[PDB]
Design a protein around this ligand. Structure first.
Ligand SMILES: CCCCCCCCCCCCCCCCCC(=O)OC[C@H](COP(=O)([O-])OCC(O)COP(=O)([O-])OC[C@@H](COC(=O)CCCCCCCCCCCCCCCCC)OC(=O)CCCCCCCCCCCCCCCCC)OC(=O)CCCCCCCCCCCCCCCCC
Ligand SMILES: CCCCCCCCCCCCCCCCC[C@@H](O)O[C@H](CO[C@H](O)CCCCCCCCCCCCCCC)COP(=O)(O)OCC[N+](C)(C)C
Ligand SMILES: CCCCCCCC/C=C\CCCCCCCC(=O)OC[C@H](COP(=O)(O)OCCN)OC(=O)CCCCCCC/C=C\CCCCCCCC
Ligand SMILES: CCCCCCCC/C=C\CCCCCCCC(=O)OC[C@H](COP(=O)(O)OCCN)OC(=O)CCCCCCC/C=C\CCCCCCCC
Ligand SMILES: CCCCCCCC/C=C\CCCCCCCC(=O)OC[C@H](COP(=O)(O)OCCN)OC(=O)CCCCCCC/C=C\CCCCCCCC
Ligand SMILES: CCCCCCCC/C=C\CCCCCCCC(=O)O[C@H](COC(=O)CCCCCCC/C=C/CCCCCCCC)COP(=O)(O)OCCN
Lengths: 56, 329, 121, 459, 53, 54, 64, 104, 175
């Protein structure tokens, strides 16, 4: 019964929320170290006609 | 195309089916021994064909089918060598095993765990086939250890008996003493020849030094129960009669002589190692015959007879007659 | 370093006016969130000491602890960032005014640099 | 990397807000889910590494250890589920909190871009395990074992802090990437010799090196099952990981400074193995076998060759799994007999046949039977030592021989022969214990199919 | 998880190395080049130190 | 086990350190609480500091 | 219980430093270490001398 | 259930504590004999005959038939050395020196 | 089979002598092989054709990754970290490539040894010589670098090798 099992099983949501939140944190870090995006000598590539960034 | 490879791999493949069925319902009935015996007979009659093909023409093949891993410049892959020795020893071993299992269906009728006994016999047979058909030192070592551990498990068949346990531990001890030399040979070969595959070892070693052949001789002496390490074979009679008849009389024991046969091109280029092999064989055969002369237990007498025969085969190895030694096997 | 005697320093200023030229820390700064977590832990310990339901004894008191910790943490972060900015400013000024003590190293390539080689055996 | 750390941290509020009779279920489920998530880290490159951020990174050496650390926690929970039946809910939650904190500290220890952060977390791990040993310990010697375990490690690791800060002040950074790329040779000087000793002793005391191993049998005997599990599987590998990381800056001094240690291991791996032949306690026997294996790993690391490094990594993983399995078996026997002596419970194969099968498989794995990863690591290290010097094989061979002996000894004394008559409280094995053993053993034989995942970055 | 580990993409670049090696040996055998070269870096780019001893 | 592991390896590092620390603690802490000796030591260390570090 | 306690934990309290125990401990704990050290140092020095002299024939020695 | 006073202690020096230790170990005072008082920590424990476990009587109704021990009897210090699966000291039809000389 | 290049893995013509029965007794080998085809090789080929046509119904391609050459360690400044990183990655990729080259040569040698049978000692001299040359080159390039191998250590080894060669050449010329 909804609103009855919730008070006992809401705790199962914590870890997956941590995982997604964790994924977001990793993504935030990635944006910061974009100082060399499409600037490495090995992967210096001209952009596509409908491209803005080599990777995200 | 070329049914030689297909049939030679099919024999080993179908030898393992009852092991997979050991969790099925047939393992909980009394029909399992007949099932395993029938499987062994079918494997033997199937393996009879590649031997016939070799007899007609002289077919030899290496099958490197699965690539296990690559370590820098070394490549370890699942390779089977199906030369004359393998295609001749497989039918003989399968015939002997079929006879032994048919006999055991009568000898071990009263044993509550007879299905486990047949399961163990089949496992030993699979490990022996793996040892014989191996093309690189790692697969050969896998078979070398498998036959030894299966002998340990089968000797201590009656685990409620102290003597069976101590005999099994003794066999393990002597075989590990041989394993020291086997591992020394493996390390030497990979360090110097940069490969464990037999073809590269044969190419790169025209004048084989003393150390790898010393290691191989030590391993062969350990597993074939030569004079230095003999007592384990006679003490290994604590096990059941069927086990002694196949594992210790005609199949597992000849592993050391077979290993020396496998590396016969390198043995003929060393004169000191052949002298040591001949001397060790001579002392082994005479000491074991002298012991068997006055023994009173029939099983011990035949065990000493087997040890003397193995010593004679090593003597044959010493005088540079490997094919004769294989025929005597 | 000892920036106590730095010239033009107001004797008892927590944050001088020149500290307002630096970017203020964001409210979602990890240090601020850590300070809030410390306040929450303090509230939980306070509830445990008084023998009260630890999680839900007083929501107002826990909120007060969290807010006070956040406030003081924000001020502390501003002061710390200002001090580090001063240290870097003094560093750069000194190296600019003393070129003889910091000569430009002649850029040398590895192709013309002999390094001894030690084999592993 | 945060996708592994954040759920582990969220494990704590989950445990503390769980029902009084559901803590084990949720803890096990979410630990297994975290292990599944951490399985993604096995995807590695032949290039440098997976540099997630400025603070954490992963390598082909850290990945197997992280996966093993994440896989360990469910097994520890299942092992500890039995003997904590009569414990208050708050204290069970404290125990699970200690386990979760230890896992979190190990997870952030194995990534550790910077050496000072690595030291901070590697010393932080000392607290939860010390509390576990000294609080939930059966015997009165748990206090002395905790003191020994704490003080050996602290005495070893205190000079390491001075060495690391000195390194940062001279070179300018402790980031591992900059350390590797800007590495310079070490001159033959007394200052550099003491630098080497400070950098090495902290990790060598935790392996443990022979002669510095007095703490390990005590900390293994007096700890609960979870403590023995974690300290035998992962906490011993902290020293090996540390030496593998730190040896990049100790060259070419290590070419001749390693001689005193190599001998101590090369002889020690023999001596302790012989100690295993005459032992009246299962836990002491397994602890001494662990000392022998870690001595062999020390030799591999000090040789400093590629094959040595891959063999050491494989041996670390295999030894961790096998030792945890053996300790689980010993604890299952203890929970029936309550004696922890080898000669009391005999002929157990007559009573518990599947447990006898588990004993046989664990002994075969400890015996280094091919093609198990135990033998892969053992053989790689043996070959590398043979290349180092042709005489080493002798000692190596002896050890191998002795190894098999005591393993089968442990199999024969406890399982074969005639059952003891006066022990009649030997209940049939539970499904929980059998599941624990299966979850221990199946990963070993699965890793045997793909060795390249545990052969380190030098593969 | 075992299936996921089995089918991991070749980020270690084994087949890439195989193919590159095949192309290099093909080229060097066709044009007669002596397979692998003893020097990893061309001597034209290293400024050696004159001894004058 | 007995001679090396249980006897001498325990004698060298742990037991020697424990014995030394216990003895030093006993020597340091064993004071009767008299300010006479305390101020006598104060005077001695004052003269030592005056005559030694300058 | 008495047998196990006597085997494990009753050694050190009954241990007294005597010339016999001191000499046996010194021998069995130091002699083997220095002996193996001398053996391996001699072997490796000989190998290094042969390598420097160039007369070792290290062909096909690729993996180390 | 085991008290502090029945655990093994230090080497007995006076006959009173010698008899007390003999009583503790469940053997006669005249049969009791501790190890010599050297540095090795044998201590209080009795010096039982070095006879192996194999040559014990195979027909006695022991409480432990496999190990051929009785419950409560003093245990040899090296029991794990003689467990019938290891070295045994049973008499042989030929003397030891003669066998060694002949094989050598 | 077109799955591999024939020139990289050269193989002999291996002409086989035609059957020449001398007696009237029918050899069971031919009957066994014919029943083997009839019972195994036909259904296997049928299933392979079915699978091949199923694959042909849905075709998609994958490409070999190309890498651009980057300045190496010999043209790198002392403390410049970015070009050092690029040089290190390039050197590691080259190292893997040479390892695979040695692997190919070793496979060639093993195949020659098995194929030529008991005439291998004379009929595989060319492969033995190629393997000797490649092994010498690889040992010169990459031996004794250690567990922590890097481009700078290889460069230092190569530089000391050039020192030895130059000194020996000068001494021989001035002998
Ligand atoms: C990188 C680190 C990451 C994590 C940080 C680590 C620390 C975290 C917490 C820090 C402290 C804060 C809380 C502690 C207060 C103490 C209260 C307590 O004892 O617990 C009772 C209480 C429950 O009990 P109760 O029913 O209320 O009443 C029982 C009485 O309170 C009391 O019961 P009792 O008196 O009847 O029972 C007595 C018992 C009770 O006595 C205690 O338990 C004392 C508490 C431990 C001392 C902590 C000291 C300060 C913290 C130090 C942290 C050190 C970290 C460094 C690592 C080293 C670890 C030592 O004492 C004993 O059993 C004696 C035996 C001694 C055993 C060994 C002692 C070891 C202690 C060391 C613990 C250190 C970590 C603590 C973890 C949290 C513990 C609650 O526990 C809690 O509820 C609090 C847990 C956390 C609440 C989570 C709520 C959040 C979920 C919703 C939001 C979701 C978040 C995500 C956002 C997005 C989602 C949408
Ligand atoms: C019990 C009664 C018998 C019933 C069973 C009968 C059937 C027998 C089958 C069982 C084994 C027989 C051998 C058959 C092997 C075939 C499968 C094998 O070939 O696949 C392996 C694959 O196996 C995996 O690689 C290994 C498993 C992964 C190991 C991870 C363990 C799971 C995580 C748990 C936590 C780990 C804790 C320890 C830390 C690491 C290797 O394949 P590979 O040649 O490479 O390439 C695969 C194909 N590619 C090319 C498309 C990629
Ligand atoms: C069973 C019923 C299903 C029947 C339909 C399948 C019929 C065959 C079709 C299979 C297609 C072929 C295939 O599986 O792919 C090849 C694939 C190899 O993949 P690769 O990437 O090319 O090479 C390995 C390196 N990555 O081969 C296989 O996986 C199957 C064959 C493997 C051999 C069997 C292995 C059994 C032994 C297990 C390992 C034992 C330990 C290791 C031994 C070490 C020896 C040195
Ligand atoms: C210069 C000063 C150097 C200081 C070095 C400090 C070393 C750390 C250990 C200090 C502990 C000393 C105190 C002590 O152990 O007392 C002896 C005490 C007497 O019994 P109590 O428990 O105190 O009695 C309780 C009933 N009243 O004996 C013990 O219990 C010892 C138990 C713990 C043993 C720990 C052993 C640690 C030694 C291992 C190596 C560490 C050495 C560190 C310094 C070495 C130099 C590099
Ligand atoms: C080098 C090897 C060093 C020896 C290692 C000793 C291991 C110590 C612990 C072993 C455990 C004790 C044990 O197994 O019990 C003894 C056990 C029981 O005795 P039984 O005869 O079966 O009595 C049954 C009737 N009641 O007997 C044994 O198995 C002990 C066997 C030890 C063998 C040692 C001798 C080996 C000598 C090797 C010399 C030959 C060198 C090689 C020559 C080959 C040519 C290249
Ligand atoms: C199980 C317990 C083990 C405990 C650890 C044992 C190892 C102890 C390591 C030595 C202690 C001091 C390490 C210092 C940290 C390294 C820093 C360094 O090396 O810098 C040196 C400084 O080196 C030192 O000062 C070291 C002096 C040692 C002082 C403390 C002695 C401690 C005992 C030493 C003997 C025991 C060491 C081995 C013990 C083995 C374990 C039992 C250079 O400094 P500069 O003066 O600027 O350079 C000179 C040129 N201008």
């Amino acid at each position: 019964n909804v609103l009855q099992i919730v008070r006992d099983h809401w705790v199962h949501i914590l870890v997956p929320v941590g995982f997604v939140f964790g994924c977001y944190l990793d993504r935030r870090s990635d944006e910061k170290l974009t100082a060399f995006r499409n600037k490495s000598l090995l992967f210096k590539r001209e952009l596509r006609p409908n491209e803005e960034v080599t990777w995200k | 195309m070329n049914p030689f490879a297909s049939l030679t791999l099919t024999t080993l493949t179908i030898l393992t089916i009852p092991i997979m069925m050991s969790n099925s319902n047939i393992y909980k009935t009394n029909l399992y021994p007949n099932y395993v015996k029938t499987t062994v007979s079918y494997a033997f009659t199937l393996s009879l064909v590649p031997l016939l093909m070799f007899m007609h023409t002289g077919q030899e093949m290496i099958i490197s089918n699965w690539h296990w891993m690559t370590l820098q410049t070394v490549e370890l892959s699942l390779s089977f060598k199906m030369d004359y020795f393998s295609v001749m020893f497989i039918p003989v071993a399968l015939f002997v095993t079929w006879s032994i299992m048919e006999f055991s269906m009568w000898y071990m009728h009263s044993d509550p765990f007879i299905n486990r006994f047949f399961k163990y016999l089949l496992l030993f047979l699979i490990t022996m086939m793996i040892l014989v058909t191996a093309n690189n030192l790692f697969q050969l070592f896998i078979g070398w250890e498998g036959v030894g551990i299966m002998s340990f498990l089968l000797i201590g068949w009656w685990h409620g008996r102290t003597d069976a346990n101590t005999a099994a531990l003794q066999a393990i001890l002597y075989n590990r003493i041989g394993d020291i030399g086997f591992v020394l040979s493996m390390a030497w070969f990979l360090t110097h020849s940069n490969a464990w595959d037999l073809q590269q070892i044969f190419m790169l070693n025209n004048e084989c030094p003393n150390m790898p052949l010393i290691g191989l001789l030590l391993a062969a002496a350990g597993k074939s129960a030569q004079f230095g390490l003999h007592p384990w074979l006679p003490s290994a009679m604590e096990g059941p009669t069927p086990v002694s008849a196949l594992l210790h009389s005609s199949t597992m024991v000849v592993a050391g002589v077979f290993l020396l046969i496998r590396f016969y091109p390198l043995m003929e280029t060393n004169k000191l190692v052949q002298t040591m092999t001949l001397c060790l064989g001579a002392i082994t055969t005479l000491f074991t015959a002298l012991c068997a002369i006055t023994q009173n237990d029939i099983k011990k007498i035949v065990a000493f007879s087997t040890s003397s025969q193995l010593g004679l085969m090593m003597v044959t190895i010493g005088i540079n007659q490997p094919h004769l030694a294989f025929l005597h096997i | 370093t000892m920036m106590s005697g730095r010239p033009g320093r107001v004797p008892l200023q927590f944050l001088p006016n020149e500290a307002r030229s630096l970017p203020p820390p964001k409210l979602t700064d990890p240090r601020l969130v850590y300070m809030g977590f410390l306040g929450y832990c303090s509230g939980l310990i306070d509830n445990a000491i008084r023998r009260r339901p630890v999680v839900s004894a007083g929501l107002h008191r826990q909120l007060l602890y969290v807010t006070s910790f956040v406030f003081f943490g924000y001020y502390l972060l501003k002061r710390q960032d200002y001090m580090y900015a001063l240290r870097d400013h003094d560093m750069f000024a000194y190296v600019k005014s003393h070129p003889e003590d910091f000569p430009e190293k002649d850029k040398k390539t590895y192709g013309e640099i002999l390094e001894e080689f030690h084999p592993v055996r | 990397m945060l996708k592994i750390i954040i759920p582990t941290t969220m494990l704590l509020p989950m445990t503390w807000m769980s029902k009084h009779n559901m803590i084990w279920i949720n803890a096990t489920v979410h630990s297994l889910l975290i292990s599944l998530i951490s399985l993604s880290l096995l995807n590695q490159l032949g290039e440098n590494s997976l540099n997630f951020s400025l603070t954490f990174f992963s390598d082909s050496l850290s990945a197997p250890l992280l996966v093993l650390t994440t896989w360990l926690l469910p097994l520890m929970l299942m092992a500890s589920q039995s003997h904590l039946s009569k414990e208050t809910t708050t204290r069970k939650k404290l125990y699970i909190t200690m386990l979760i904190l230890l896992q979190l500290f190990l997870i952030m220890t194995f990534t550790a871009t910077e050496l000072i952060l690595f030291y901070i977390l590697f010393e932080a791990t000392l607290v939860p395990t010390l509390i576990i040993i000294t609080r939930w310990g059966n015997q009165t010697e748990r206090l002395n074992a905790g003191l020994y375990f704490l003080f050996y490690t602290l005495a070893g690791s205190l000079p390491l802090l001075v060495a690391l800060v000195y390194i940062q002040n001279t070179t300018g950074s402790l980031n591992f990437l900059i350390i590797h790329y800007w590495s310079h040779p070490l001159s033959n000087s007394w200052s550099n010799i003491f630098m080497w000793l400070a950098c090495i002793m902290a990790f060598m005391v935790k392996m443990p090196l022979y002669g510095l191993h007095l703490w390990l049998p005590k900390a293994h005997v007096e700890a609960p099952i979870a403590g023995s599990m974690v300290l035998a599987a992962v906490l011993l590998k902290l020293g090996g990981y540390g030496m593998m990381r730190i040896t990049t800056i100790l060259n070419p001094l290590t070419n001749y400074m390693a001689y005193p240690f190599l001998m101590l291991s090369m002889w020690g791996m023999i001596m302790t193995s012989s100690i295993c032949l005459r032992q009246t306690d299962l836990k002491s026997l397994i602890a001494y076998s662990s000392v022998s294996h870690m001595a062999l790993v020390i030799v591999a690391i000090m040789i400093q060759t590629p094959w040595s490094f891959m063999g050491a990594t494989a041996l670390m993983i295999a030894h961790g799994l096998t030792s945890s399995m053996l300790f689980c078996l010993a604890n299952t026997n203890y929970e029936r007999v309550h004696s922890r002596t080898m000669i009391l419970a005999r002929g157990l194969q007559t009573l518990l046949p599947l447990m006898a099968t588990w004993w046989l498989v664990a002994s075969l794995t400890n015996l280094a039977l091919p093609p198990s990863i135990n033998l892969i690591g053992e053989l790689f290290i043996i070959t590398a030592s043979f290349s180092w010097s042709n005489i080493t094989i002798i000692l190596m061979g002896m050890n191998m021989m002795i190894t098999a002996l005591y393993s089968l000894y442990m199999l024969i004394t406890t399982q074969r022969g005639k059952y003891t008559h006066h022990i009649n409280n030997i209940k049939p094995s539970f499904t929980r214990e059998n599941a624990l053993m299966a979850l221990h053993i199946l990963p070993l034989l699965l890793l045997t199919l793909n060795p390249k995942m545990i052969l380190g970055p030098l593969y | 998880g075992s299936t996921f580990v089995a089918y991991l993409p070749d980020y270690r670049m084994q087949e890439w190395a195989r193919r590159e090696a095949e192309r290099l040996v093909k080229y060097r055998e066709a044009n007669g080049l002596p397979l692998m070269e003893s020097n990893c870096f061309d001597p034209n780019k290293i400024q050696l130190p004159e001894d004058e001893d | 086990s007995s001679l090396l592991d249980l006897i001498w390896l325990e004698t060298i590092l742990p037991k020697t350190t424990s014995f030394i620390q216990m003895k030093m603690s006993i020597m340091v802490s064993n004071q009767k609480g008299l300010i006479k000796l305390y101020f006598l030591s104060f005077l001695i260390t004052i003269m030592i500091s005056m005559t030694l570090f300058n | 219980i008495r047998w196990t306690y006597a085997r494990s934990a009753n050694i050190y309290p009954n241990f007294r430093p005597t010339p016999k125990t001191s000499l046996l401990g010194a021998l069995f704990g130091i002699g083997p270490l220095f002996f193996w050290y001398y053996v391996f140092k001699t072997d490796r020095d000989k190998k290094e001398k042969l390598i420097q002299e160039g007369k070792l024939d290290q062909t096909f020695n690729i993996s180390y | 259930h085991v008290t502090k006073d029945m655990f093994p202690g230090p080497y007995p020096k006076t006959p009173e504590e010698r008899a007390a230790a003999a009583k503790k170990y469940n053997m006669r005072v005249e049969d009791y004999e501790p190890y010599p008082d050297d540095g090795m920590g044998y201590g209080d424990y009795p010096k039982l005959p070095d006879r192996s476990q194999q040559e014990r009587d195979p027909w006695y109704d022991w409480d432990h038939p496999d190990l051929r021990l009785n419950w409560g009897e003093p245990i040899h210090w090296d029991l794990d050395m003689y467990i019938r699966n290891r070295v045994d000291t049973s008499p042989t039809p030929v003397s030891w020196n003669t066998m060694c000389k002949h094989l050598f | 089979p077109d799955s591999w290049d024939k020139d990289v893995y050269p193989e002999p013509p291996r002409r086989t002598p035609a059957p020449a029965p001398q007696t009237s007794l029918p050899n069971p080998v031919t009957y066994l092989t014919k029943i083997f085809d009839l019972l195994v090789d036909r259904p296997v080929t049928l299933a392979r054709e079915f699978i091949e046509q199923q694959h042909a119904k849905n075709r998609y391609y994958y490409y070999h990754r190309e890498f651009r050459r980057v300045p190496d360690i010999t043209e790198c400044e002392e403390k410049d970290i970015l070009c050092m990183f690029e040089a290190e990655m390039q050197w590691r990729r080259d190292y893997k490539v040479d390892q695979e080259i040695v692997n190919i040569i070793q496979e060639r040698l093993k195949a020659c040894q098995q194929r030529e049978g008991e005439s291998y000692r004379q009929n595989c001299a060319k492969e033995l010589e190629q393997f000797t040359q490649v092994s010498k080159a690889f040992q010169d390039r990459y031996s004794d670098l250690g567990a922590h191998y890097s481009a700078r250590k290889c460069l230092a080894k190569q530089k000391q090798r050039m020192l030895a060669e130059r000194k020996a050449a000068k001494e021989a010329a001035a002998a």
